[PDB]
Design a protein around this ligand. Structure first.
Ligand SMILES: [Cl-]
Ligand SMILES: [Cl-]
Lengths: 460, 461, 454, 455
């Protein structure tokens, strides 16, 4: 432990700590959750501070040697080398000013090790305020999370579902509506439905990016840009785009809206929440399809991933659909916290940013990781019980309707009843009731009862 | 009372519905609230378009189809809103309300001498599962395009007009509710206007999927027992007759019946708009707070006496209506997502509940946005001189004095200005700082609070 | 020209529909708030009428109001309470958040009624004597909610509990396979499952009763801000005594703290949490029941639900129940949102909170009785099918754990599935009948009804 | 050499050489890398306590050899104490029964015992008489009950006491009431704080009211609630040991063993109380930051203690952000709670994460709020009295003498002419037989108008 002195007081910080006094005071002020910023927010703070130093150097406001040291330090933070140097609670001052100062202090300590003296506020925070920085970092992280990680994971899941839909194009089975027997579908058609939900999910995320990517940087304390260069925003954004390749980043359409509100995070959480709703449907159908082996639906077999029960030997459970539906619940909860924070800004500043940031970035992370796992450890290895599915379809009261024009709906209903009673196919029941004659050939019967043709699947 | 038929069922004399509707009436006495006029309208539009297409394809006799088209137009025109008694909380496919529509059409046609079978004729090529969701998405799409977006535009334009009027009305900023550097009222209102403009963008961005219709998918999405092009033909007629260009056949017919994800998506946009409106309305009632113990920045138009007991008091009732509507939209949004997530296999069976909530959220936001615009925003007046005096008295504006008198003396100016409740300018003077290091002209340039707000400068015209 | 008359308030003159019993302030509110198109419910109008009568009674008792005026208010308030004048309450739910407009609606309509019997009442000075909207509208709201809880919801839940409990008794020995993670588990009885459902509803009643000490708190007497200004010091205790006497609801009480009772609506938030928990319970019960009724061929086909429209019946009441639960969850979020956002001496989200909490009580009340009477009571069990499912679960190997150990039991279950044999046959075929396991042991242990430990 | 082979009924698994977990835990490490966060200290504590108690009872009943039971009890005590938290690597977002974390505890106990020369089978011995399906929700409800009783209620009591202390200190500090954000009649700062204190007091009542069901434990129901493979009194014996060790008398066996496993309704109920407390805290914190606002542009009614380093209301901001998180967590909890199927609700680890977090946030921020914000507030007494006297609504007690409509005209003219209400009553010639100047000055005393009660 080393000793430091702010105005006014003495504070002890850990010897290995690169943060300084203001960060240590915040550590002492907010012992609330014990959880600090995630890797992605820390990275984005590093990206922002490097770009700001670049621009301050470019405009002749910051000595090049100082700028170069900030840029080098900030690069180390952005590269994830100092994730342990950010100890401040998520539940901190609502502008995120404490984490902003944490970044400035850590950068100055890194630079000191290379022989360059940096003032955390006067140099590392030059042209910035305690209010346009943390939300800028939040939107960088969220935009990067969307574009570089979530959309590719969703595409991977989409592609897995679509491949199954193709494999199972002719795997006929009974539809279910209201959980009751219905006319035939194919397993491929159902999975093409799941694939569309994920594809629409990607479209939903893409549609929020024009506003998610808006950055407040340059608006300084109240959105007016006082004490910054007039073009600071567009210059900093240009550097960030050039360096990251994230072309979705842009200066805000209105500098006051970009600090008074965090509506872009609320909008984006809505898209994540819709994806959670879709994933809930997909995962719950899939675990119901896999239910059994003997007292359930037994339509498909999920890959085994681990023993199911500490007490019931040999049982295996749909653990990936469970992870997906729990993740979806968490995204829904996080979404409510985000909206609550978003609605409650006042005048020139929304002061729920650290909480909103935690929730939106966690939702991105959970959906990204569980989507890849779902695709790779569950969807890819599904196998269908093809004969079981076809037998139930061919035995269903739902398929007697195309018999009506041959034998009348009365006799069709009798066929339906006897088929259930004897657990027979409709076909065999028609034969056993002696209905094959000049009225109905066996070839006409097989045409009328072609359950795959009833599913009306496009041939390829 | 009349008797019908299984049977036997008693139905009110002047009722155009028949036995199945009356059964549903007896099965679901839950909320006492039925379909809204917009949903009834959409069912009418859909039934008329289906009859047109069945007629075109030679599946339905022209005189039967003509009778359906005439009856459906009456329903769509709002002539029979009292003929749909079934609870919202009905069978989750909306099949009861679908049959309600079929029965009412058949009764209307009967009065014209034409006999229609509610199922075989009016429900021809349709199922108990692709129709109610189609009508829901028609209603929601119309609500978005024909009503909500124009109402939001009206509010945007009213906010933007105030931003323009108040372009030079300088005041102190507030961050964390604490004194901050100068802004203008016009800047704040341009921020509010952007939030509403962004709200319109959000609604527009959900329309490609909100406008997707299930019609043609029949019982499970396969289109069994309908013509293969039933969907595209019905959509063609609907778009031609209504002008609702956003309507389209669904990209995937199973997704369009197994899920209502487009309603969940659209509710998110409405919910974000509710979040924006909460900010805007809160700020405005705080700006209007007082008259003497609050912020007193602006005056809201009086709309009614404030209090049954405190005489003369007037309250920010339009902001209250807006923030209460926003809470309702947030609650409706949670119900919609809950319904959306819980479909099974080929059918989501939460449609009537989801429909009730999404359409009510459209309606509330539409109506309160226009009232907010017209009865509050349009008539706001600013206490211009009060605002400016507070800005000119702020410790936050001494910074541009630093390069003239040093930051230590600037802090002393700040301290003294507060203690004496004087402006910074007057304090600088009262401390004898005006000499050859600082002329009065220089002082006024440095302490120009409007320039500190950095408002955009307009051109010479 | 003869379509309207002129009324006035402190803001000026207002044209009012000629036949309307309301006056200037109601009419302003009609024009200010055309938002949802829906006004106060019957139950809300009743509680407002009841409250106004009770206030006039107490003002009469204390000699503050002339008995002739007091009697006219009490007479008119009773007409309002009984539902004679619901069409004279046109104001939207989404009005000023104190309910000022609906309070004046009641004052003005009472004044107009009393005018027809020859008595002149000032809507503020007489009908609203000793009162504010800020204590009377939350009081009317909590009266309605307390009444909904005690007189309607709890009895409806008890009816549902009793229907569930009767099935648990009737089906006490109907053995079936338990399911966990949706996969084949050890035996249970249908009766045991329904005893679980009954407990959830019983616990639901316990949750509603636990909120009553704060739901029943009334703000009446606090007037403008909670200080009681312009009311007798004992106005609250006296009005509540009249209320208790007239309604029979002993749960109504004066607030513990008069400032908390007006600055916040925390008791409505609290009560919504109990309703939301009940919606969560109902979702589980209804989902299980529609899955048990599923199929028959493609589903579990465990039970048959009564057919209501008009054998493969759609589970229409489970669908109504789970949709109602979704609504209660949505209403609950709206209520908490309004609840959190009070400022200083007043929470101004009351009409919206009232709309949602009263609707949640109504939906749960009505759907629970329907569910109990028209679904639960007439359920029939496919007893032989259920026993066959119980017998076929590979997890019936579980009671052999103490005899052959977890790992060998797992090997048994897997082979039985692979070779399509019973567990008993597989235990035999694996040569496990020996020193530490006999056929007698299996007859004892593999008995599926005994395994359910009923 | 950096790994070893372990096995389960699904096959062989490579496990890090130094790890005390075994095959099923390692499978779960690979199956669920989702959030990157595992069980909390309190959850691992409760799991350790529970395994120890189970071994004690199995020993008592002669079902488990004493030296095996002793080894389990000793290992479980080390886990409970926190010596092995680094041995619990499994994600929160695992199988929804918590099977993986249950086997995590079983495997780590087996490895700890092996070091002392005792061989335990993770299933047959450490998991004897148990399922994940009764033990994981039992450990969850133990942890939740302990959080409520030993941590949250004392934290709320501390906040209540700090607020009540201000209500006393400021009992006669008169100010203007505000309703709809507009000028109302007088209140005292103390009266307002007595309202805040009651909200927190009611919050404690709300937490106390959920304990009879929060404290219900599924232990003994094993796989589905029937108690199969467990002694008929396993549950009650285990609960007695837990109550004795923890001192938590609120722990109890479940009223119905099927409800206790098929649903997690007690967590949903408890979250509702926490959500209500968040709603209260939001009102309290908002009022306090608005009272401290400005000073020039705001209300400037009170001064908040400066914490870093015009002081920003950072603790009210922490409180309102925590409340938002509690509301979010509460929605996640209800969602998981609703979606059980048949004999098991499979959202337990997610529901546990969220309810335990909500307890923790409310506990810690309530203590910080009490000590570092509420206790040091100072009132601007003269400014507050000036606000009270300036409100035009102070005309209200004249209603009985001049009627509502005239009093309204008085308030309107006072505002217009920038005069006091007293002068305006005079200017309008209202002093007469129905209102003397002595009555007027009696009725307009703002402290008296606040009607603060005798102490
Ligand atoms: Cl297809
Ligand atoms: Cl390790």
């Amino acid at each position: 432990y080393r000793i430091e002195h702010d105005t006014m007081g003495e504070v002890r910080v850990p010897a290995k700590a690169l943060w300084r006094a203001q960060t240590q005071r915040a550590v002492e002020n907010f012992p609330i959750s014990g959880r600090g910023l995630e890797r992605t927010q820390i990275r984005a703070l590093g990206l922002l501070k490097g770009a700001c130093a670049q621009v301050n150097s470019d405009l002749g406001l910051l000595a090049p040697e100082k700028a170069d040291a900030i840029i080098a330090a900030a690069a180390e933070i952005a590269d994830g080398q100092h994730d342990d140097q950010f100890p401040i609670d998520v539940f901190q001052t609502g502008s995120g000013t404490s984490s902003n100062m944490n970044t400035n202090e850590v950068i100055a300590s890194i630079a000191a090790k290379g022989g360059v003296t940096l003032h955390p506020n006067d140099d590392v925070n030059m042209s910035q305020s305690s209010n346009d920085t943390f939300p800028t970092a939040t939107h960088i992280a969220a935009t990067e999370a969307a574009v570089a990680h979530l959309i590719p994971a969703l595409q991977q899941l989409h592609d897995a579902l679509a491949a199954k839909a193709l494999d199972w194009h002719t795997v006929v089975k009974s539809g279910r509506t209201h959980l009751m027997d219905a006319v035939p579908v194919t397993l491929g058609q159902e999975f093409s439905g799941y694939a569309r939900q994920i594809e629409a999910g990607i479209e939903r995320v893409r549609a929020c990016l024009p506003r998610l990517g808006e950055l407040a940087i340059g608006g300084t304390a109240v959105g007016t840009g006082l004490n910054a260069p007039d073009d600071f925003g567009v210059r900093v954004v240009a550097v960030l785009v050039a360096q990251t390749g994230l072309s979705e980043l842009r200066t805000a359409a209105n500098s006051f809206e970009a600090q008074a509100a965090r509506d872009g995070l609320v909008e984006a959480s809505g898209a994540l929440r819709t994806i959670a709703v879709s994933l809930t449907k997909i995962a719950n159908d899939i675990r119901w399809m896999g239910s059994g082996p003997l007292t359930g639906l037994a339509e498909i077999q999920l890959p085994d991933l681990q023993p199911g029960s500490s007490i019931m030997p040999g049982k295996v459970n749909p653990v990936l659909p469970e992870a997906v539906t729990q993740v979806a619940a968490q995204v829904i909860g996080n979404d409510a916290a985000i909206a609550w924070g978003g609605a409650n800004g006042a005048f020139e500043l929304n002061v729920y940013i650290p909480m909103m940031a935690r929730n939106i970035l966690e939702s991105f992370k959970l959906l990204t990781n569980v989507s890849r796992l779902f695709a790779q450890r569950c969807i890819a290895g599904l196998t269908a019980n093809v004969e079981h599915l076809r037998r139930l379809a061919e035995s269903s009261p739902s398929i007697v309707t195309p018999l009506n024009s041959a034998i009348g709906y009365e006799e069709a209903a009798a066929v339906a009843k006897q088929a259930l009673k004897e657990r027979k196919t409709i076909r065999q029941t028609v034969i056993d009731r002696g209905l094959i004659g000049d009225r109905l050939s066996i070839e006409d019967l097989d045409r009328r009862l072609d359950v795959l043709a009833m599913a009306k699947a496009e041939q390829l």
